[PDB]
Amino acid sequence: DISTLPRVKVDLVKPPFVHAHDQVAKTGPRVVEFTMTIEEKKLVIDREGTEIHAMTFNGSVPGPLMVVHENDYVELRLINPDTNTLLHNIDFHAATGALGGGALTQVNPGEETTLRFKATKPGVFVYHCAPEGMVPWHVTSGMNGAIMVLPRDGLKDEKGQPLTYDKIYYVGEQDFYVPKDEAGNYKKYETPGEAYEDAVKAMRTLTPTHIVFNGAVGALTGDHALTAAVGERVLVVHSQANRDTRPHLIGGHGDYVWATGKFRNPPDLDQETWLIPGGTAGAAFYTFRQPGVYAYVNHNLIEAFELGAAGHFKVTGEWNDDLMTSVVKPAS
Amino acid sequence: DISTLPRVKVDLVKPPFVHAHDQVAKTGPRVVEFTMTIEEKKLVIDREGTEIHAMTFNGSVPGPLMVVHENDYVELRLINPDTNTLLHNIDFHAATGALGGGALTQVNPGEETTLRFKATKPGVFVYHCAPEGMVPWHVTSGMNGAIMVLPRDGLKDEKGQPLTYDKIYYVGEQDFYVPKDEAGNYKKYETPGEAYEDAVKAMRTLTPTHIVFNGAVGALTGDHALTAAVGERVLVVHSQANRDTRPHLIGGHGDYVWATGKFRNPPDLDQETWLIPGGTAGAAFYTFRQPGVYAYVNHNLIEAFELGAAGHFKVTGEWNDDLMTSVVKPAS
Amino acid sequence: DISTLPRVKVDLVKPPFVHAHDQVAKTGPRVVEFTMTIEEKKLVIDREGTEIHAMTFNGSVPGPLMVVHENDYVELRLINPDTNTLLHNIDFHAATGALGGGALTQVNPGEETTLRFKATKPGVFVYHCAPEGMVPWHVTSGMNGAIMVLPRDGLKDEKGQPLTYDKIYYVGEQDFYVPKDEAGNYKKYETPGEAYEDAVKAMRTLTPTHIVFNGAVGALTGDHALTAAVGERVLVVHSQANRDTRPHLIGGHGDYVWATGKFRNPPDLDQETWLIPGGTAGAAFYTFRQPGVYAYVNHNLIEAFELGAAGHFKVTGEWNDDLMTSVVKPAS
Numbered sequence: 001d002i003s004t005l006p007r008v009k010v011d012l013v014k015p016p017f018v019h020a021h022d023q024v025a026k027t028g029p030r031v032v033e034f035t036m037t038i039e040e041k042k043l044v045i046d047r048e049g050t051e052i053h054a055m056t057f058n059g060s061v062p063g064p065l066m067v068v069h070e071n072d073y074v075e076l077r078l079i080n081p082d083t084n085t086l087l088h089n090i091d092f093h094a095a096t097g098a099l100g101g102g103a104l105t106q107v108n109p110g111e112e113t114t115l116r117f118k119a120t121k122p123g124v125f126v127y128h129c130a131p132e133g134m135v136p137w138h139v140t141s142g143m144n145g146a147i148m149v150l151p152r153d154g155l156k157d158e159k160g161q162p163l164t165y166d167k168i169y170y171v172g173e174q175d176f177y178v179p180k181d182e183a184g185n186y187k188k189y190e191t192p193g194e195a196y197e198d199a200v201k202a203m204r205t206l207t208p209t210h211i212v213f214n215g216a217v218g219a220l221t222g223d224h225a226l227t228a229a230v231g232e233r234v235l236v237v238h239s240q241a242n243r244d245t246r247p248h249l250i251g252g253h254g255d256y257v258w259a260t261g262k263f264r265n266p267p268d269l270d271q272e273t274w275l276i277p278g279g280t281a282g283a284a285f286y287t288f289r290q291p292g293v294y295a296y297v298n299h300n301l302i303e304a305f306e307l308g309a310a311g312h313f314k315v316t317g318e319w320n321d322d323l324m325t326s327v328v329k330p331a332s
Numbered sequence: 333d334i335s336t337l338p339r340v341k342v343d344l345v346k347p348p349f350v351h352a353h354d355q356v357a358k359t360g361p362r363v364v365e366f367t368m369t370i371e372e373k374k375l376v377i378d379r380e381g382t383e384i385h386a387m388t389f390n391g392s393v394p395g396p397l398m399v400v401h402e403n404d405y406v407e408l409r410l411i412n413p414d415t416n417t418l419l420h421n422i423d424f425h426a427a428t429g430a431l432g433g434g435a436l437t438q439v440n441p442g443e444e445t446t447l448r449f450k451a452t453k454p455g456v457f458v459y460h461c462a463p464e465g466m467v468p469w470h471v472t473s474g475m476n477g478a479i480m481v482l483p484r485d486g487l488k489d490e491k492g493q494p495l496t497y498d499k500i501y502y503v504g505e506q507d508f509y510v511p512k513d514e515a516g517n518y519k520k521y522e523t524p525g526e527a528y529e530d531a532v533k534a535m536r537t538l539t540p541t542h543i544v545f546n547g548a549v550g551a552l553t554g555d556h557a558l559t560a561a562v563g564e565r566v567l568v569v570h571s572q573a574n575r576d577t578r579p580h581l582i583g584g585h586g587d588y589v590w591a592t593g594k595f596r597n598p599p600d601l602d603q604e605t606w607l608i609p610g611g612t613a614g615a616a617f618y619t620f621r622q623p624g625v626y627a628y629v630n631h632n633l634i635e636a637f638e639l640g641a642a643g644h645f646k647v648t649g650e651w652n653d654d655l656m657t658s659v660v661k662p663a664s
Numbered sequence: 665d666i667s668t669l670p671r672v673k674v675d676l677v678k679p680p681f682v683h684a685h686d687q688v689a690k691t692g693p694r695v696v697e698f699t700m701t702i703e704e705k706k707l708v709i710d711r712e713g714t715e716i717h718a719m720t721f722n723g724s725v726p727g728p729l730m731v732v733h734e735n736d737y738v739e740l741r742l743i744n745p746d747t748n749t750l751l752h753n754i755d756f757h758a759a760t761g762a763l764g765g766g767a768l769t770q771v772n773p774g775e776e777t778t779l780r781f782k783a784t785k786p787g788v789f790v791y792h793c794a795p796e797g798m799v800p801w802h803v804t805s806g807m808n809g810a811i812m813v814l815p816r817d818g819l820k821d822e823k824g825q826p827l828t829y830d831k832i833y834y835v836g837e838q839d840f841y842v843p844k845d846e847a848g849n850y851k852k853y854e855t856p857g858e859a860y861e862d863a864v865k866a867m868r869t870l871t872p873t874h875i876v877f878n879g880a881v882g883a884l885t886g887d888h889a890l891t892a893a894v895g896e897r898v899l900v901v902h903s904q905a906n907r908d909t910r911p912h913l914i915g916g917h918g919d920y921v922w923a924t925g926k927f928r929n930p931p932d933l934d935q936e937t938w939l940i941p942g943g944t945a946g947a948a949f950y951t952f953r954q955p956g957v958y959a960y961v962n963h964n965l966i967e968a969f970e971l972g973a974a975g976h977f978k979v980t981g982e983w984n985d986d987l988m989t990s991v992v993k994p995a996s
């Protein structure tokens with residue numbers, strides 16, 4: 001009887017940060033209550049000032065990471081305020097039935113709904129909007145995020161021993177398809193209905209104009225670089241709701257990687273790069289061994305360095321000359 | 333001595349259905365006899381009426397699924413009737429030697445041939461036509477299918493326990509490259525020789541115009557939706573002879589997935605989405621837990637919903653409100 | 665104390681050949697000394713005579729395969745002669761810290777540097793140039809190779825039993841983005857600075873003009889086909905520094921495949937085709953069972969047969985009619 005279970009309300013945080021949770025479950029199964037408010041908003045996505053009409057869960061691209069344990073119930077109140085213009089819904093890849101919830105969550109502006117589902121499978125999973133007939137438009141306008149369903153006893157390595165992260169980050173990677181005129185400049189539009197056919201045309205090229213982390217070129221750099229210290233264990237959850245990606249930590253590795261995100265499987269060890277298929281979340285665990293700047297990229301390096309799919313870590317601590325050193329510095 | 337082995341003749345069926353077979357082998361090794369007749373034919377591939385000249389095994393895109401057991405011999409009579417115009421052959425990825433059989437099976441119109449090979453490795457595998465100098469044209473004109481080589485003791489899970497499917501379906505996914513003029517409309521052609529250079533040009537864009545299941549937009553929908561019942565165990569074999577895909581069951585999972593199709597490996601568990609590389613067949617096993625409509629898609633959602641890579645399941649049975657429920661239906 | 669370790673100097677060879685080494689380490693950990701000299705040079709990459717300005721390690725595309733054992737130190741002297749025009753560096757995906765070495769190895773023309781790193785993880789790994797702000801241009805101009813870090817006790821199968829190769833080859837796969845004018849012909853350029861914006865434009869299409877093995881269409885064919893004999897065990901290391909590939913041996917298999925290249929993981933068995941993500945090296949082990957010609961391809965068959973990603977093996981020995989035979993040769 002679900003009404004006999006504890007309820008716990010989660011207050012979500014903006015990516016790449018993750019709401020507080022416990023890796024090993026400290027209670028029995030719970031109904032974990034989340035609320036998200038859909039926001040259609042203008043977003044500047046590149047250094048040139050390109051502005052799109054984004055479609056967001058909770059004001060961010062990606063939407064926030066939700067965290068529960070296996071066999072918890074996820075109860076989401078989804079709000080579509082009347083200041084939005086479009087119908088929206090939500091599909092959880094973690095859920096079973098009704099198109100992941102999408103068939104049960106269609107909300108016009110001015111409406112809300114509450115969905116509950118049992119998180120029966122452990123892993124990281126995509127969630128995304130999926131309105132019938134408009135699915136890729138919403139997804140590729142930023143309307144996607146992820147949920148992590150932890151095993152009740154936390155993560156385990158390939159031998160069944162615990163893996164405990166000290167920090168966790170959520171990198172959502174977004175492919176945008178900003179319509180281009182025949183000279184190659186972006187078009188912007190006066191209403192969503194006026195934009196729809198050229199959005200479809202742009203999407204049908206299968207060639208993103210932008211591929212970004214955390215909603216914009218450079219979002220995970222500078223004052224918003226990811227951080228760690230030498231010796232810290234970091235889990236990086238990475239999602240891509242629509243298109244393949246190949247994450248890579250420049251100067252590091254994925255020590256343990258669930259490339260397709262499902263924790264009942266043993267992780268892949270010692271990865272340089274891994275393939276997260278479109279429509280999937282993956283997770284990589286790494287223990288930092290060197291300080292300095294790292295780049296975290298999609299290792300299609302055109303996608304990374306020309307289209308935007310690159311962020312930074314700033315890592316503090318002691319340099320290990322045994323692992324790496326300049327024997328003779330660059331010189332004539 | 334192969335002549336001392338039983339022979340069994342298989343009568344193939346049209347995808348997505350699969351000819352009758354036994355998961356666990358009920359006999360010793362056999363020579364399993366198949367016949368396929370090549371058919372070049374016009375096919376309408378989309379709702380707009382776009383018509384291509386398809387190149388088929390047995391009249392369908394994809395060609396039919398062949399099913400044998402490990403260490404059976406596959407003996408294929410391949411017929412190229414004189415009503416066709418082109419040379420064709422067949423390459424089995426399941427086979428060893430002679431370019432998978434392609435070097436031994438070149439048939440002009442009016443010819444036939446019989447190839448035998450030993451199915452030494454268990455898995456699902458692509459087969460496709462591959463005429464020297466014309467390989468991607470034939471493949472991307474629909475001339476590909478798959479073969480399943482079951483272990484003699486049937487499928488097993490990651491722990492070595494049996495997995496027994498109640499139903500099996502074969503989804504062949506086809507990328508087409510219909511030539512476009514500079515305004516973007518399709519060109520159609522008066523002979524295959526007149527079409528060849530612009531087919532090559534279209535292919536070299538690496539951008540399909542259409543990506544379809546079972547040969548056309550919407551083929552696996554409506555009266556031709558896939559079906560199941562709650563509690564049934566379903567294996568979905570999925571092939572892509574030329575280009576990566578990322579299957580996903582909307583509202584479900586791959587409970588056990590051989591993403592690259594080879595049954596000696598343990599399956600991946602609990603997948604949301606999986607990557608089947610171009611040139612591969614994969615297989616996913618799922619036990620349905622909820623009734624209703626599901627979409628089965630390539631989770632590049634542009635490829636699915638704009639280019640055609642989407643089908644449906646219609647599932648009968650009882651709804652489980654513990655797994656999912658609408659707590660508060662959409663309302664103001 | 666690293667100065668107490670043996671030093672061994674390796675003399676590299678041109679791909680697809682691999683410098684001599686021992687699978688099982690015959691000594692304790694060593695400092696393995698390599699020297700590479702950067703060469704910017706014109707290269708003809710296709711049958712039409714298309715000429716690019718390649719950026720190479722040691723004069724080849726790909727750069728040579730380096731081979732060490734786990735817990736050896738790699739000490740690379742990297743030389744940028746004053747006959748080159750650009751700044752270069754090197755990033756080893758095998759290494760930890762300083763962007764894989766790139767932050768420590770920036771050499772102007774007329775400079776050299778020596779980097780040392782500890783090869784702490786076994787596998788095959790990409791290395792590539794990565795000058796800040798110019799990364800994909802250098803990589804997609806050919807400035808990438810691979811390093812193999814063998815386990816000290818050599819390779820093992822999924823059950824922990826030895827796998828010993830008789831031959832090894834290194835196939836580097838290169839995506840080139842030769843700029844095209846609006847009629848589709850290649851542009852060539854008078855200086856690298858004059859080429860840079862249109863290189864970026866070409867790259868941003870995400871559509872290679874050429875995808876080649878060993879630096880050119882047809883490089884691994886004819887007198888330069890790969891060779892083997894029936895019964896020989898062959899390891900094929902395959903890298904792609906920038907873009908996904910899907911290798912396939914036509915007429916064979918990957919008997920044991922590390923698709924993402926990391927030897928602590930059990931290999932995948934019996935693969936037809938496997939996905940090597942951009943930014944990764946993979947390795948496939950096969951024992952030849954039939955003589956004749958094989959094609960080794962990227963199984964996007966457009967990429968293989970139209971864009972260049974195809975090579976050949978020529979295999980000597982006895983034909984096995986039990987594995988495959990023509991029962992009835994093509995005839996009316």
Ligand SMILES: O=N[O-]
Binds near residue numbers: 118120
């Ligand atoms: O609790 N069974 O999903």
Ligand SMILES: O=N[O-]
Binds near residue numbers: 164
């Ligand atoms: O933080 N416990 O390993």
Ligand SMILES: O=N[O-]
Binds near residue numbers: 218221222223225
């Ligand atoms: O928004 N960070 O640069």
Ligand SMILES: O=N[O-]
Binds near residue numbers: 242243244245278632
């Ligand atoms: O190419 N990735 O969907």
Ligand SMILES: O=N[O-]
Binds near residue numbers: 248249301756757764
């Ligand atoms: O080494 N990362 O491009």
Ligand SMILES: O=N[O-]
Binds near residue numbers: 258260261603
């Ligand atoms: O989902 N396996 O990483």
Ligand SMILES: O=N[O-]
Binds near residue numbers: 450
């Ligand atoms: O029966 N040996 O392939």
Ligand SMILES: O=N[O-]
Binds near residue numbers: 496
């Ligand atoms: O249908 N036997 O599990």
Ligand SMILES: O=N[O-]
Binds near residue numbers: 550551552555
């Ligand atoms: O052909 N089924 O819609």
Ligand SMILES: O=N[O-]
Binds near residue numbers: 574575576577610964
């Ligand atoms: O992008 N798949 O071949």
Ligand SMILES: O=N[O-]
Binds near residue numbers: 099130582583633
């Ligand atoms: O949840 N499938 O788009």
Ligand SMILES: O=N[O-]
Binds near residue numbers: 591592593932933935
């Ligand atoms: O082929 N392994 O799924």
Ligand SMILES: O=N[O-]
Binds near residue numbers: 782784
């Ligand atoms: O030797 N420790 O990397």
Ligand SMILES: O=N[O-]
Binds near residue numbers: 828
């Ligand atoms: O060559 N030893 O298996």
Ligand SMILES: O=N[O-]
Binds near residue numbers: 882883885886887
């Ligand atoms: O360079 N071999 O054809």
Ligand SMILES: O=N[O-]
Binds near residue numbers: 906908
């Ligand atoms: O599509 N591969 O980067």
